[PDB]
Every structure is written in C-alpha cells, then in structure tokens.
Design a protein around this ligand. Structure first.
Ligand SMILES: Cc1ccccc1N
Length: 330
C-alpha cells in the first residue's frame, strides 16, 4: 500500500504545517501537525477541557463505531517549546492520504497548554519519530508509520515541505518526479528515539564550505533551524545590523536586509537554504526588527534541522531494519 497527503502551512510564515487525517467511522477529518520529533498521535477531542478549546476541530469517539477505549491507558507529553498535553487513549481507524491503519492509538486530550489552545489551526499532532518515545502508559503504543510499515510497498515516508506553499507527505514510495539530481543517504542513530544524523558541514552565502560534523535531528515539528552558536554567529555576522537579543529570545535583523543563503552538508552533497527562507518577519506587528530563522541550539542540548532546513529538500525517512535519512535538492 501507499498514501499521499498534501501538507499546508498554517500561516504566512510557515510556522507549522497541517495535514488532513481521517479518524473513525464515519470519518472525522482533523488537521494534524506531522511531527518527526515526537511519537504520539494526539487530538483535540470531546474530552478536552472546554475552556482550552478555541476553534479547533475535535474528535468525538462516541460518534465512531470503530472507536474503543484503551482501558487504563493515559498519556502526557511536553515539547521543546514548553508546551504540553495529556489525556486518555482510544484505538480507532486512521487514514492518511488513502493509507489506512486499523487499531491505531488515538490519544484524546483532556488538557492542553495555552499555545495549543491559542492555535486554532492545529487539531493535534501525528508523531513520526521512533515508537520508543511514545508516552502512553502502562502499555507504550506504536506510531502510525510503525503500524503501517509492514503493509507499505517500501518501509519509508517522505517529507516535501513547501516554502510559503503546500507540499506533500508520502508513505510507502519515493516520488522520483519530486526532486532533482540524486538522493544522498546518511546514517541515523535511533538511540534517543529521533531521526538523528550528522551533517558534514556548512557554508554561508557564497562562502567556502566548512567541513565539520554537526549532529542533529530531522524534525518537521520544529519551525526553525537550531545549530551550534559558532555556526549561527558566522551566519548572522554576514547580515548588517543583525544581533542576538536576550529580550526577544534570539537573533534579529533589520527587516530591510537581504539575507544570505545557508548551505548544509549531507555526505558529499549540499542542500542550499535560500536567504528568504530564513526571514520570519517582524518581531511584533509593525516592527522593523525581523526574527531570524537560524538560531542557536545552545541550551537546547541538541541541534535541530527543523522546517527551515527541511523545506529546502526532498527528505526520505527510511524505516528499513537499519534506518537512514535521504536528502535531495528540489
Ligand atoms: C524534538 C526535540 C527534542 C529535544 C529538544 C527539542 C525538540 N524539539
């Protein structure tokens, strides 16, 4: 089998991407944030504290003839941005772009933190990291990808995120029309439960490539590119007036600037992030200070190849017995 679904930016800045997902019988369609940095499929629901729901579409398990309470199971998660959610668990039929899994754990939120409430466009998350990170207790549950894997034509999914435009998540096949040149594959460590790999270096604009190992994770659920302070300083030093602002919480730059590109290495290959991808607009409405799309990972404890990086590439998440990651230009 295969599946193919379009993913759409939630706003004009590509702060996140939503993909429609069918849950239950008859189908209830929710717009979920596909997140290769976590491993829980959770949704706003009829059980979510009413004051914490503000415009989201909810899953109502009592209206699904295929929903079953997973007795005794609970979940609780907290993300790198400080947000969190928790609740109980049903199993139900879940379909993405024509690909169907029966008996998928659908984690129903009883509580969500303010940042989820305040974002009316995201109805939940669909985790695509390794199932060892799933938070369901006392019986850990599998991700949608892990449940689908054996049925797929090939044990892979791909992320093709757009810049200020829709893109595609495919399951079970590689669309050879969706990228240019060849796909370069690189080793993955699953030891922390993430799609963790090592970039071979970087360049700033038209500058020379610096060969240096940069361990990090491929994370579709993180907006920005978080890299070591040395790398980030070298980037922003090429932008007149750019500075790190403790009050704002990162590098800012004059909105009048034209930003240089940023290149990262994948083996002997190179992915180029155009400068415009690194512009996240005014720090507050009407400001002439703009927020940077490349930020320091110091204090996170891990480097994160988030959407800013991933949307410059066609990315293969290869879930074969030994997982690997593939990157192509597009
Ligand atoms: C996926 C992730 C892991 C660790 C810290 C932050 C994030 N976003």
């Amino acid at each position: 089998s295969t599946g193919s679904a379009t993913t759409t930016p939630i706003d004009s800045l590509d702060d996140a991407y939503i993909t429609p997902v069918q849950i239950g019988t008859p189908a209830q369609t929710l717009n979920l944030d596909f997140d290769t940095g976590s491993s829980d499929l959770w949704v706003f629901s009829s059980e979510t504290t009413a004051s914490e729901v503000d415009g989201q579409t909810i899953y109502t398990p009592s209206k699904s003839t295929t929903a079953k309470l997973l007795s005794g199971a609970t979940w609780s998660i907290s993300y790198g941005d400080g947000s969190s959610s928790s609740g109980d668990v049903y199993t139900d039929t879940v379909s993405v772009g024509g690909l169907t899994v029966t008996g998928q754990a659908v984690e129903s939120a009883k509580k969500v933190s303010s940042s989820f409430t305040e974002d009316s466009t995201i109805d939940g998350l669909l985790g695509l990291a390794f199932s060892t990170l799933n938070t369901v207790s006392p019986t850990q549950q599998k991700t949608f990808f892990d449940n689908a894997k054996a049925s797929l034509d090939s044990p892979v999914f791909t992320a093709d995120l757009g810049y200020h435009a829709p893109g595609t998540y495919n399951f079970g096949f590689i669309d050879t029309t969706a990228y240019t040149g060849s796909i370069t594959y690189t080793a993955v460590s699953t030891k922390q439960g993430f799609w963790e790999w090592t970039s071979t270096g970087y360049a700033v604009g038209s500058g020379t490539f610096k060969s240096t190992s940069i361990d990090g994770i491929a994370d579709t659920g993180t907006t920005l590119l978080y890299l070591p302070a040395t790398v980030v300083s070298a980037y922003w030093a090429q932008v007149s007036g750019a500075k790190s602002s403790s009050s704002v919480g990162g590098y800012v730059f004059p909105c009048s600037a034209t930003l240089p590109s940023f290149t990262f290495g994948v083996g002997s290959a190179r992915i180029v992030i155009p400068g415009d991808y690194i512009d996240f607009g005014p720090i507050s409405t009407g400001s002439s200070s703009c927020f940077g799309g490349i930020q320091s990972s110091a204090g996170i404890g891990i480097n994160i190849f988030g959407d800013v990086a991933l949307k410059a590439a066609f990315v293969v998440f290869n879930g074969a017995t030994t997982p690997t990651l593939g990157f192509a230009s597009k």
